[PDB]
Design a protein around this ligand. Structure first.
Ligand SMILES: *[C@@H]1O[C@H](CO)[C@@H](O[C@@H]2O[C@H](CO)[C@@H](O)[C@H](O)[C@H]2NC(C)=O)[C@H](O)[C@H]1NC(C)=O
Ligand SMILES: *[C@@H]1O[C@H](CO)[C@@H](O[C@@H]2O[C@H](CO)[C@@H](O)[C@H](O)[C@H]2NC(C)=O)[C@H](O)[C@H]1NC(C)=O
Ligand SMILES: *[C@@H]1O[C@H](CO)[C@@H](O[C@@H]2O[C@H](CO)[C@@H](O)[C@H](O)[C@H]2NC(C)=O)[C@H](O)[C@H]1NC(C)=O
Ligand SMILES: *[C@@H]1O[C@H](CO)[C@@H](O)[C@H](O)[C@H]1NC(C)=O
Ligand SMILES: *[C@@H]1O[C@H](CO)[C@@H](O)[C@H](O)[C@H]1NC(C)=O
Ligand SMILES: *[C@@H]1O[C@H](CO)[C@@H](O)[C@H](O)[C@H]1NC(C)=O
Ligand SMILES: *[C@@H]1O[C@H](CO)[C@@H](O)[C@H](O)[C@H]1NC(C)=O
Ligand SMILES: *[C@@H]1O[C@H](CO)[C@@H](O)[C@H](O)[C@H]1NC(C)=O
Ligand SMILES: *[C@@H]1O[C@H](CO)[C@@H](O)[C@H](O)[C@H]1NC(C)=O
Lengths: 237, 197, 242, 50
């Protein structure tokens, strides 16, 4: 109820709809396993890490058999077959090639590590903000109005389950900025003036719940000769 | 160009303009309601009254000062084109990308004229003036130099791409937070109290 | 033919890139231009082999004269793909606004469609208000750490050759730098997980009776029956990643 | 050149990844909504130009 109250909905909305909300949450949680399983490439991000590491190691090991412009790629054969004053020239090419390969591998690893660290920082921030509290940043903890979240662990990563709130089943209405009565302008405290065609009510913004206009949910603060589009109707007390 | 090519982007400028126009129409005619579900209609003055109410000023302040606010907004919008045109280096950030790309490509193509301690810098001249047994010694130096140049260019490109990605992520976050809603973070979407973007 | 006014003493011509692009014929004094012959990459467009066996070929940055059957795009010459007018969500990107897909069954090329056209009936005395709500749950995946490694220079480069090591030590101290870089990477890999997960100092435990007013948390709470003490979703995630 | 090894495959893979990332950047920044809204023909918004 408090989490609903954080997004601008009263508590009686939850307290009179507990069963429906519980059932919707249960079904939404249930569908998650099938959604994850059916899609084959849902976890490509966590597989690319293993693929990249394996490919880099395989390339580095495979590079050992190259010649780099030498008689052969094995030191033991080059040494025994040839005179040493050719050997100290032939060894240098292999040494330089292998050193260059090592440097390339190390630089690639550093570049990948930077991106991995950035991703880890983002994940830590998301865990701090979406899970340990309620967030008001738009589209940071899901799509909709954030309610709460649950973390799960995966190999070389983390997985989040965001719970949100989505409106539905809207309707046409007619509205006015203020209500005039006895030459006094009236503005709503929280909500919007609304009319169904013949009567005028005041209701909250994210849920249709009409109320009788009263001095308790309005404040006067002005006159009736300034506001553009004012509509005059009786205000009860 | 000798083996150097430039590929066209996937999205043309017309499509990007269509995306921007759709975002503007949605935020004008719905507010922030279209960023979290179906779009819901609302008159613009009522939207702006809600946005003032979101920073600590009551609605009667807007409703009694509509014309003044509209005129100030119109003048502020009008001054933008002159401000952009007058300042010479207002768009240095976008020009630097093109300048750096051009510099890198020019240096890479210029590196093909180096000798790297050989008799000549042209392969055809080496082939047509010598015997294959005496050509590998010359060819190896050119091969090593050109490989080094390519590796340097690739490393620089990767390093630049990382920073470009960081900037793109920041831009995406700004679009999600300042345009599709109202931000209470200080100095994130301008200087002052944020209204809309 | 050329249009460059050579002075009576030049013979060649260059550009910014310092390459030959002009020459004069010795027998008949005439100015001629030199241009490289066309070249470019080749890309193959195919659906999965489980579905069909046909392919299409794109020659990047060449008009179709140099090489359904043919179609000219802004990216090059497309061969073996038929062009239609209908627009769908993009399947295989090709070039500047063009996509391809497999649709009795052939490979077609079209122009991508951005989205469904919509319009809201704006009026300055009208408003819309929702009357019903929906609760939705969505996922998000983020990498945290990767594999830690360490390399030994002498074993990798020389193996067990003494003279190879004796020549190698003459170069300098590159290997100390390599070791330092790898060690820093490994330490950062540990710190990433330590920062992400170690957020709380206590170890809370759920009550034995799992009644929370009608909410079912069986799919996320740890399962004591299995030895690994993992939730079913965690088990699925661990089994899918291989 | 064929004797040196497999540097070219690495170069090609790096450049291809860079290009794919470049496309994804714009795709992420701009393609936020999935509907194409259109502004009303009558451009009156209470006294504001747009
Ligand atoms: C609000 O939305 C919910 C979800 O669609 C509606 O719940 C359904 O109501 C019908 C009619 O009473 C039932 O037959 C369905 O079984 C309900 N669904 C579930 C999941 O329980 C609810 O009726 C809507 N509220 C209103 C006032 O229409
Ligand atoms: C909480 O949800 C789980 C998941 O559906 C329920 O477990 C199911 O219970 C039914 C009824 O006994 C079985 O037919 C299913 O096979 C169970 N599924 C699984 C995966 O075990 C569980 O009963 C729910 N808790 C309560 C108190 O109802
Ligand atoms: C919005 O501002 C524009 C620019 O001042 C107004 O359009 C101008 O209208 C006058 C008189 O019709 C013309 O002389 C100008 O040439 C127009 N400007 C341009 C750039 O073409 C426009 O009238 C304003 N909006 C409204 C609703 O009046
Ligand atoms: C609101 O009214 C407009 C015009 O009468 C209509 O097109 C629109 O569908 C209405 N809203 C709903 C939710 O039906
Ligand atoms: C509008 O609401 C009033 C108050 O309940 C009711 O008496 C009237 O019949 C309603 N009119 C319409 C058209 O729904
Ligand atoms: C009430 O509003 C109507 C229409 O706006 C207006 O004609 C009438 O004069 C108003 N009542 C009074 C007492 O002014
Ligand atoms: C295709 O080649 C022809 C050659 O005659 C040329 O006229 C035409 O301009 C070329 N198309 C493009 C797009 O360059
Ligand atoms: C769609 O078909 C029409 C037929 O009248 C044609 O004129 C138009 O060029 C086609 N659109 C294309 C090819 O993009
Ligand atoms: C807005 O109200 C004015 C009244 O001054 C009216 O002329 C205009 O038609 C209204 N807007 C629309 C879209 O009808």
């Amino acid at each position: 109820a408090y989490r609903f109250n954080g997004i601008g909905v009263t508590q009686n909305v939850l307290y009179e709809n507990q069963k429906l909300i519980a059932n919707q949450f249960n079904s939404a949680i249930g569908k998650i396993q099938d959604s994850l399983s059916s899609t084959p490439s849902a976890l490509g991000k966590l597989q690319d890490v293993v693929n990249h590491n394996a490919q880099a190691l395989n390339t580095l090991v495979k590079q050992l058999s190259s010649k780099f412009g030498a008689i052969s790629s094995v030191l033991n054969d080059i040494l025994s077959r040839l005179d040493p004053p050719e050997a100290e020239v032939q060894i240098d090419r292999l040494i330089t090639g292998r050193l260059q390969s090592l440097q390339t591998y190390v630089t690639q690893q550093l570049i990948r590590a930077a991106e991995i660290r950035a991703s880890a920082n983002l994940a830590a921030t998301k865990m701090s903000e979406c899970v340990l509290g309620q967030s008001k940043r738009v589209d940071f903890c899901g799509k909709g109005y954030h309610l709460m979240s649950f973390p799960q662990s995966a190999p070389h990563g983390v997985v989040f389950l965001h719970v949100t709130y989505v409106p539905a089943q809207e309707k046409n209405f007619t509205t006015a900025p203020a209500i005039c009565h006895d030459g006094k302008a009236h503005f709503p405290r929280e909500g919007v003036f609304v009319s169904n065609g013949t009567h005028w009510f005041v209701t909250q913004r994210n849920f249709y719940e009409p109320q009788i206009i009263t001095t308790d949910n309005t404040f006067v603060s002005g006159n009736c000769d300034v506001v553009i589009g004012i509509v005059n109707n009786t205000v009860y007390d | 160009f000798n083996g150097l090519t430039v590929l066209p982007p996937l999205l043309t400028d017309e499509m990007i303009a269509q995306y921007t126009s759709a975002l503007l129409a949605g935020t004008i005619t719905s507010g922030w309601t279209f960023g979290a579900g179906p779009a819901l209609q609302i008159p613009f003055p009522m939207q702006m009254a809600y946005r003032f109410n979101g920073i600590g000023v009551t609605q009667n302040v807007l409703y009694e000062n509509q014309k003044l606010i509209a005129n100030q907004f119109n003048s502020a919008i009008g001054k933008i084109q002159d401000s952009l045109s007058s300042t010479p280096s207002a768009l240095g950030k976008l020009q630097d990308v093109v300048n750096h790309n051009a510099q890198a490509l020019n240096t890479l193509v210029k590196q093909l004229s180096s000798k790297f301690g050989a008799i000549s810098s042209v392969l055809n001249d080496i082939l047509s003036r010598l015997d294959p047994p005496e050509a590998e010694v010359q060819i190896d130096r050119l091969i090593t130099g050109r490989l080094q140049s390519l590796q340097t260019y690739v490393t620089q490109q990767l390093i630049r791409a990382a920073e470009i990605r960081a900037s793109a992520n920041l831009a995406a976050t700004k679009m999600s937070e300042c345009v599709l809603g109202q931000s209470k973070r200080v100095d994130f979407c301008g200087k002052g109290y944020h209204l809309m973007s | 033919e050329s249009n460059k006014k050579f002075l009576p003493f030049q013979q060649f011509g260059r550009d910014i890139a310092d390459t030959t692009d002009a020459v004069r014929d010795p027998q008949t004094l005439e100015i001629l231009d030199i241009t490289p012959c066309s070249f470019g990459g080749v890309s193959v467009i195919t659906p999965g082999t489980n579905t069909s066996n046909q392919v299409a070929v794109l020659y990047q940055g060449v008009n179709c004269t140099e090489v359904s059957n043919v179609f000219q795009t802004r990216a090059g010459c497309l061969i073996g793909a038929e062009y239609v007018n209908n627009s769908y969500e993009c399947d295989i990107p090709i070039g500047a606004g063009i996509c391809a897909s497999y649709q009795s069954q052939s490979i077609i090329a079209y122009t991508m469609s951005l989205g469904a056209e919509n319009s809201v009936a704006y009026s300055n005395n009208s408003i819309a208000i929702p009357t019903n709500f929906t609760i939705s749950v969505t996922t998000e995946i983020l990498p945290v750490s990767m594999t830690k490694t360490s390399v030994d220079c002498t074993m990798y480069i020389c193996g067990d050759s003494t003279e190879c090591s004796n020549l190698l030590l003459q170069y300098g101290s590159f290997c100390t730098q390599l070791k330092r870089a790898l060690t820093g990477i490994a330490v950062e890999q540990d710190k990433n997980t330590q920062e992400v997960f170690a957020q709380v100092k206590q170890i809370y435990k759920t009550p034995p009776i799992k009644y929370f007013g009608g909410f079912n948390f069986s799919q996320i709470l740890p399962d004591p029956s299995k030895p690994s003490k993992r939730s079913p979703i965690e088990d699925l995630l661990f089994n899918k990643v291989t």
